[PDB]
Amino acid sequence: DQLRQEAEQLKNQIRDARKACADATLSQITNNIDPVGRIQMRTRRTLRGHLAKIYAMHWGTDSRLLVSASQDGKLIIWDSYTTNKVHAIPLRSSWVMTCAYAPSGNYVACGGLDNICSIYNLKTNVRVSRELAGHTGYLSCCRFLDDNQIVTSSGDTTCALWDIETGQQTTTFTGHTGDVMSLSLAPDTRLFVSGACDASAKLWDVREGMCRQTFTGHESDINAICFFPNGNAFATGSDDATCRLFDLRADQELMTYSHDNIICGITSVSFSKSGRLLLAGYDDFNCNVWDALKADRAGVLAGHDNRVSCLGVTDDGMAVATGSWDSFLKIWN
Amino acid sequence: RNEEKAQREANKKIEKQLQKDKQVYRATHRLLLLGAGESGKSTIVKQMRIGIFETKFQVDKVNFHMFDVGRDERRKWIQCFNDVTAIIFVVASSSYNMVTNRLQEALNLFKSIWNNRWLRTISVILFLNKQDLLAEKVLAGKSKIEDYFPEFARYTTPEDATPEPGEDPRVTRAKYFIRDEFLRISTASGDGRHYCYPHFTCAVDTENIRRVFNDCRDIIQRMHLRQYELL
Amino acid sequence: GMGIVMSLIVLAIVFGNVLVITAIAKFERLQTVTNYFITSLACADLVMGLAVVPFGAAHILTKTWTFGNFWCEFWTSIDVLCVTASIETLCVIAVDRYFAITSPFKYQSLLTKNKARVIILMVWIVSGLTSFLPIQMHWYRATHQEAINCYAEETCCDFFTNQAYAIASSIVSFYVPLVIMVFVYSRVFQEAKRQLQKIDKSEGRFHEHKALKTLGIIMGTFTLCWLPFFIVNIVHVIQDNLIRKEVYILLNWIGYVNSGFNPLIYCRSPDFRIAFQELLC
Amino acid sequence: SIAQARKLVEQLKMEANIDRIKVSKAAADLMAYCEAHAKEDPLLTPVPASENPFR
Numbered sequence: 001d002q003l004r005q006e007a008e009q010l011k012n013q014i015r016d017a018r019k020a021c022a023d024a025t026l027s028q029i030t031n032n033i034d035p036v037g038r039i040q041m042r043t044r045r046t047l048r049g050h051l052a053k054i055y056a057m058h059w060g061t062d063s064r065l066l067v068s069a070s071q072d073g074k075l076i077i078w079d080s081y082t083t084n085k086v087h088a089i090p091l092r093s094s095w096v097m098t099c100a101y102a103p104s105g106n107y108v109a110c111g112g113l114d115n116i117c118s119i120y121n122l123k124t125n126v127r128v129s130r131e132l133a134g135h136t137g138y139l140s141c142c143r144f145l146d147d148n149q150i151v152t153s154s155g156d157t158t159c160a161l162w163d164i165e166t167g168q169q170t171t172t173f174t175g176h177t178g179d180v181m182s183l184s185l186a187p188d189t190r191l192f193v194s195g196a197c198d199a200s201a202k203l204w205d206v207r208e209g210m211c212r213q214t215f216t217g218h219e220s221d222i223n224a225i226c227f228f229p230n231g232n233a234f235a236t237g238s239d240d241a242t243c244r245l246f247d248l249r250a251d252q253e254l255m256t257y258s259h260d261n262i263i264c265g266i267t268s269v270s271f272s273k274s275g276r277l278l279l280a281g282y283d284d285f286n287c288n289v290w291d292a293l294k295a296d297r298a299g300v301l302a303g304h305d306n307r308v309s310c311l312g313v314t315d316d317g318m319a320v321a322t323g324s325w326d327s328f329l330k331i332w333n
Numbered sequence: 334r335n336e337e338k339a340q341r342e343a344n345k346k347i348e349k350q351l352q353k354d355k356q357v358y359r360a361t362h363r364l365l366l367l368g369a370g371e372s373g374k375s376t377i378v379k380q381m382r383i384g385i386f387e388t389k390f391q392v393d394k395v396n397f398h399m400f401d402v403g404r405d406e407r408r409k410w411i412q413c414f415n416d417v418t419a420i421i422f423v424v425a426s427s428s429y430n431m432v433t434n435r436l437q438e439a440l441n442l443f444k445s446i447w448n449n450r451w452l453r454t455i456s457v458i459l460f461l462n463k464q465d466l467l468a469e470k471v472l473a474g475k476s477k478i479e480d481y482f483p484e485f486a487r488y489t490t491p492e493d494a495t496p497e498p499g500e501d502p503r504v505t506r507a508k509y510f511i512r513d514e515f516l517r518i519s520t521a522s523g524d525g526r527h528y529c530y531p532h533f534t535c536a537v538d539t540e541n542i543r544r545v546f547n548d549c550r551d552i553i554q555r556m557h558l559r560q561y562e563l564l
Numbered sequence: 565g566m567g568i569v570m571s572l573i574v575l576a577i578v579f580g581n582v583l584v585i586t587a588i589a590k591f592e593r594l595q596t597v598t599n600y601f602i603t604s605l606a607c608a609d610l611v612m613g614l615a616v617v618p619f620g621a622a623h624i625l626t627k628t629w630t631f632g633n634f635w636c637e638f639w640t641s642i643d644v645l646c647v648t649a650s651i652e653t654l655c656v657i658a659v660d661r662y663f664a665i666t667s668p669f670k671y672q673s674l675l676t677k678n679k680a681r682v683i684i685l686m687v688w689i690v691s692g693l694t695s696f697l698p699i700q701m702h703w704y705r706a707t708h709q710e711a712i713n714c715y716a717e718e719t720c721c722d723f724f725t726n727q728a729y730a731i732a733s734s735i736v737s738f739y740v741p742l743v744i745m746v747f748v749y750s751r752v753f754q755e756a757k758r759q760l761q762k763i764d765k766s767e768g769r770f771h772e773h774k775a776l777k778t779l780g781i782i783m784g785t786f787t788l789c790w791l792p793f794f795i796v797n798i799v800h801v802i803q804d805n806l807i808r809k810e811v812y813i814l815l816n817w818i819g820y821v822n823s824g825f826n827p828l829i830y831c832r833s834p835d836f837r838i839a840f841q842e843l844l845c
Numbered sequence: 846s847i848a849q850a851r852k853l854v855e856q857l858k859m860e861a862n863i864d865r866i867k868v869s870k871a872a873a874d875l876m877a878y879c880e881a882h883a884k885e886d887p888l889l890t891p892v893p894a895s896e897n898p899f900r
């Protein structure tokens with residue numbers, strides 16, 4: 001019981017330290033910037049063919065092809081420009097909760113309630129290539145670090161880095177208390193962050209194999225996380241209908257995004273090319289467009305008949321695509 | 334130029350395959366099998382067969398598809414099961430004198446399932462296993478249910494009670510008391526959107542599949558009746 | 565004096581049907597196999613209210629047909645077509661409800677989007693076969709002196725038919741789509757009562773008028789609207805000089821009003837309410 | 846158990862010592878980056894329909 005006193009003493013010490021470094025709030029500095037203004041968008045393409053609700057999607061590195069997964073047990077690779085299909089890969093397990101597209105464009109991975117991550121080969125038709133096992137809980141997200149190693153986060157309060165060629169775990173990241181829900185990698189692929197179910201987002205270093213920092217601004221479960229293009233900040237979305245912009249060097253949050261007319265949860269968060277606009281999905285059957293530096297809403301992306309569960313922006317910053325439980329994908333511009 | 338034609342041909346082939354698969358997807362009914370530990374969830378599944386353990390059966394040219402999950406106090410993955418036909422709940426009725434007695438935990442789990450936001454319109458088929466173990470302990474038994482449940486004193490056998498042949502007037506009271514402890518939590522917050530079907534199950538029983546079939550048919554019929562505003 | 569009420573009836577018929585058609589077409593969530601029949605009924609009612617009602621009002625107010633024989637025959641044929649096509653759709657809707665309720669496990673396979681179009685086109689074909697064919701070519705004409713006298717006149721546009729056609733059209737249009745509806749709704753009511761009784765037996769202690777009321781509106785409005793006309797129609801042919809022209813046209817015009825109540829009856833779902841709130845609000 | 850409390854103590858001890866900068870500098874850096882990449886994203890500024898690949 002000595003530790004409870006000890007740990008409590010340290011937590012008190014850090015809070016004073018972060019506090020001293022507050023020369024001024026970001027809203028104080030960002031007060032005279034000309035507003036972005038109203039942002040009007042219209043849907044350009046509508047992709048149909050899915051039998052059930054959609055949970056995940058991921059844009060290709062060429063801003064041309066994308067992948068999506070549904071509860072019908074089927075991955076489909078579309079063609080954004082010509083709105084026609086390219087591939088359709090069946091699945092052994094009908095419950096999938098994530099998908100990813102390799103940076104080289106040769107592999108696609110997916111996981112689900114069954115505790116296995118599967119990798120498919122697209123440039124041989126398409127047949128399962130490798131099955132990775134070892135997690136004791138359902139997978140939540142997975143991202144391709146490179147063409148030979150993949151990092152996954154599961155529901156058993158752990159994250160791990162895999163080796164595709166050998167199929168064995170290389171490093172294991174522990175320290176969370178509740179389930180892990182999402183992650184995002186640094187642009188230079190040296191660090192990544194994860195949002196847990198205990199309202200705490202942590203920073204990891206694959207090379208260090210050890211946690212570096214922790215942020216505890218929220219008060220409910222964390223559903224999604226996105227990383228600022230600079231590499232020194234990230235944004236989070238939780239179940240308390242709020243978005244918060246954290247920071248790495250300052251080691252404390254800067255601004256919060258919320259409105260009094262919305263009481264629903266948040267499902268996805270993404271940035272734009274320049275990082276000026278923060279696009280976030282909601283459970284209110286539509287999407288909102290925020291302002292990164294002033295926290296003023298500048299548009300609404302409506303048109304979905306059910307909740308939005310996916311959101312992604314092309315590497316070229318040309319179009320933003322959304323997914324919903326209505327089994328329909330859209331391309332906005 | 335011909336690349337567009339080849340891509341269109343591939344699109345057409347994929348579309349034909351998807352159209353073929355759509356009917357098979359719509360034909361089947363999906364069931365979720367949920368219960369506590371030592372409940373008997375695996376067994377009932379074995380009788381139907383003759384990380385997630387799937388199974389399929391076909392009755393009267395109608396095919397069903399059952400899923401058994403799993404271990405966490407909060408289940409976030411339960412939001413993915415809002416399109417199932419029904420949820421099968423399995424509880425051990427004889428464990429009121431074991432280990433926070435196992436029943437009260439089962440009651441709390443059932444209450445948590447019933448009031449979940451994502452499962453507002455999902456019916457629950459309730460199975461009461463170990464009927465045999467309960468009677469041997471309940472009658473010609475060392476201990477009473479009262480000690481573990483004070484409300485048993487102010488409870489009378491329901492008049493509607495319909496005892497099967499050869500059973501004592503105490504074991505019937507115990508069985509119907511256990512059933513009413515679940516029926517109370519079901520009736521109060523439903524709003525008529527969803528219902529519960531109590532049942533009595535033992536190890537030597539062969540009519541479970543027919544019961545599930547009849548319950549699914551009743552659920553579908555009641556949903557259709559409510560949709561058209563006749564109920 | 566009558567012009568105001570006739571214009572109000574025409575506007576009421578047109579507005580609801582066009583609103584329902586637009587709501588079904590614009591939004592993809594309402595595109596259901598059941599909603600195709602409602603769409604066909606809406607088109608039939610819109611065509612009726614746009615074609616036969618205004619010219620009938622003009623004829624009754626003016627008391628003199630200002631067109632030729634061809635236009636009068638065309639108007640009569642389109643009247644018969646619309647009236648015939650506006651009832652078999654109701655019968656099909658009742659049969660669809662019967663199949664959906666009493667056969668829950670086979671509703672999905674039996675009724676598909678491919679069969680609905682075939683059924684709708686078959687209904688329209690059988691409706692048009694008994695309206696344009698026997699009227700446009702002269703088989704509805706009568707032989708008595710007043711009939712031929714009106715036929716000769718270029719400004720006389722009235723209604724005179726033989727026993728055979730007057731009986732066949734009534735049998736095809738009303739009674740066959742009536743006995744089926746009665747049987748279907750009796751069976752549906754029995755099933756609903758059984759379900760309610762089972763619910764009460766299962767859990768009545770802790771906790772049949774809605775179905776009765778719904779069937780009450782659904783059957784009563786149609787029966788009261790279309791019943792007396794389709795008996796006076798047979799009566800005035802089976803024997804002569806009993807039914808006055810004014811009472812006949814009054815009952816016929818009473819029957820016309822039924823095409824304006826269907827949007828208020830078959831489109832009361834909350835999804836339709838939010839759809840109607842989405843636009844024009 | 847006791848160790849799980851103990852582990853928190855060592856790591857928390859690590860987080861305590863870290864080089865931190867004033868939030869004004871970080872805010873200025875974010876503002877400068879956003880102003881530097883301001884005119885190179887079609888989402889913020891609607892580009893003409895000639896170069897739009899979706900039209």
Ligand SMILES: Nc1nc2c(ncn2[C@@H]2O[C@H](COP(=O)(O)OP(=O)(O)OP(=O)(O)O)[C@@H](O)[C@H]2O)c(=O)[nH]1
Pocket residue numbers: 368369370371372373374375376462463464465466535536
């Ligand atoms: N006496 C008795 N044993 C039973 C009954 N039902 C199941 N069992 C026994 O229970 C043993 C193992 O527990 P099960 O009841 O199968 O339940 P389980 O699926 O293993 O347990 P959980 O999944 O943790 O709920 C089996 O070997 C069965 O013989 C029953 O009604 N009476």
Ligand SMILES: CN[C@@H]1CCc2c(ccc(O)c2O)[C@H]1O
Pocket residue numbers: 640643644647648723730733734737816
């Ligand atoms: C001019 N009004 C017509 C005349 C006769 C007729 C009607 C409707 C259905 C029929 O089967 C008929 O024979 C009426 O609507």
